[PDB]
Design an enzyme around this catalytic site. Structure first.
Site, short mmCIF file in Angstrom:
data_model
loop_
_atom_site.label_atom_id
_atom_site.label_comp_id
_atom_site.label_asym_id
_atom_site.label_seq_id
_atom_site.Cartn_x
_atom_site.Cartn_y
_atom_site.Cartn_z
N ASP A 35 0.81 -1.21 0.00
CA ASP A 35 0.00 0.00 0.00
C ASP A 35 0.85 1.27 0.00
O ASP A 35 1.36 1.68 1.05
CB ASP A 35 -0.93 -0.03 1.21
CG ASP A 35 -1.81 1.20 1.31
OD1 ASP A 35 -1.89 1.96 0.33
OD2 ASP A 35 -2.43 1.39 2.39
N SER A 199 -0.58 15.81 -11.86
CA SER A 199 -0.83 15.44 -13.24
C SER A 199 -1.06 16.70 -14.06
O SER A 199 -1.61 17.68 -13.57
CB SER A 199 -2.03 14.50 -13.35
OG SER A 199 -2.38 14.28 -14.71
#
Length: 330
Positions: A35, A199
């Site tokens: 994770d 992004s």
């Protein structure tokens, strides 16, 4: 040193991935959920409340000759999906795909929430975010990657998650045969303890690319792609019959619809998520309504590039002095 381990979807939808991990001496092999959105290595154990164990493999510290109680240490964690677990701590030898750390904090669950009990395929989590998020008290503990880092050939690990198929976690090296083209690297902020990046934008199917900054985290421990409501609305508007269902708790669509791809920007580069990756199947057995793999992050408070996004790429988690993230097509 290096390590390399295969990671395997727990089910036919890629709801999560498990990776085998050796703990203790002799080795006890548990299948852990790697994770990159958390920083605790915790396991089902001999100490876990009996009624809360249902099929998982447990770690038994008393059977490990290298296990040592970390005296006075406790841990307690809650995850974004409302699940939780807590317990005490041992140090022990932990190996992943040939790479061994001695003195790793292994957090032994005394209590786990129902979500964990109900998932017989996940024996615990292995956190790969920054150690500043680790919940052990009074002395915060280091992640497996942090402990291994100095010994690694290169201070990196990579995630290569499969679509309805096994993939690979590598430590200490970049497998240049595992991706196409080049790896584009992008800046990371560690201020919230995550692999947080920005992004450069998105496109829906064959649509034109929208340049816009989307701050989010690269999180292997989250199934879906969670993005701003504007972005998510623009995606599902291109799917006939798609709608946001309050009762279901997100966007659903008729399984007879064809899903467009979703492209996200990494600097000047582009990662394309095929439409099929965004299908998470019927909301209930036999339903013609399918759950979408792109959902709104509104009210999470952060955007999450989860497995839906990451499995479309070869992803480098670069733990150099100034960390960065790399993405390649594959």
């Amino acid at each position: 040193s290096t390590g390399s381990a295969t990671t395997t979807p727990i089910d036919s939808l890629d709801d999560a991935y498990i990776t085998p991990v050796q703990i203790g001496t002799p080795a006890q092999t548990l299948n852990l959920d790697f994770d990159t959105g958390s920083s605790d290595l915790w396991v089902f154990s001999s100490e876990t409340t009996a009624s809360e164990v249902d099929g998982q493999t447990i770690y038994t510290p008393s059977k490990s000759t290298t296990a040592k109680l970390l005296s006075g240490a406790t841990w307690s964690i809650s995850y974004g999906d409302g699940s939780s677990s807590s317990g005490d701590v041992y140090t022990d030898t932990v190996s992943v795909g040939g790479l061994t750390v001695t003195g790793q904090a292994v957090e032994s669950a005394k209590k786990v929430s129902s979500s964990f009990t109900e998932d017989s395929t996940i024996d615990g989590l292995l956190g790969l975010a920054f150690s500043t998020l680790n919940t052990v008290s009074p002395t915060q503990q280091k992640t497996f990657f942090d402990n291994a880092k100095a010994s690694l050939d290169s201070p990196v690990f990579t995630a290569d998650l499969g679509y309805h198929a096994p993939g690979t976690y590598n430590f200490g090296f970049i497998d240049t045969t595992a991706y196409t083209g080049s790896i584009t690297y992008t800046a990371v902020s560690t201020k919230q303890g995550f692999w947080e990046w920005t992004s450069t934008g998105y496109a829906v199917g064959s649509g034109t690319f929208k340049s816009t900054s989307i701050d989010g985290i690269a999180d292997t421990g989250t199934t879906l792609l969670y993005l701003p409501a504007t972005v998510v609305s623009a995606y599902w508007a291109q799917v006939s019959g798609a709608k946001s269902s309050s009762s279901v708790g997100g966007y659903v669509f008729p399984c007879s619809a064809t899903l467009p791809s979703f492209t996200f920007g990494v600097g000047s580069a582009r990662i394309v998520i095929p439409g099929d990756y965004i299908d998470f199947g019927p909301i209930s057995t036999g339903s013609s309504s399918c759950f979408g793999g792109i959902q709104s992050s509104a009210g999470i408070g952060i955007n999450i590039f989860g497995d839906v996004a990451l499995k479309a790429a070869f992803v480098v988690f670069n733990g150099a002095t100034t960390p960065t993230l790399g993405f390649a097509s594959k």
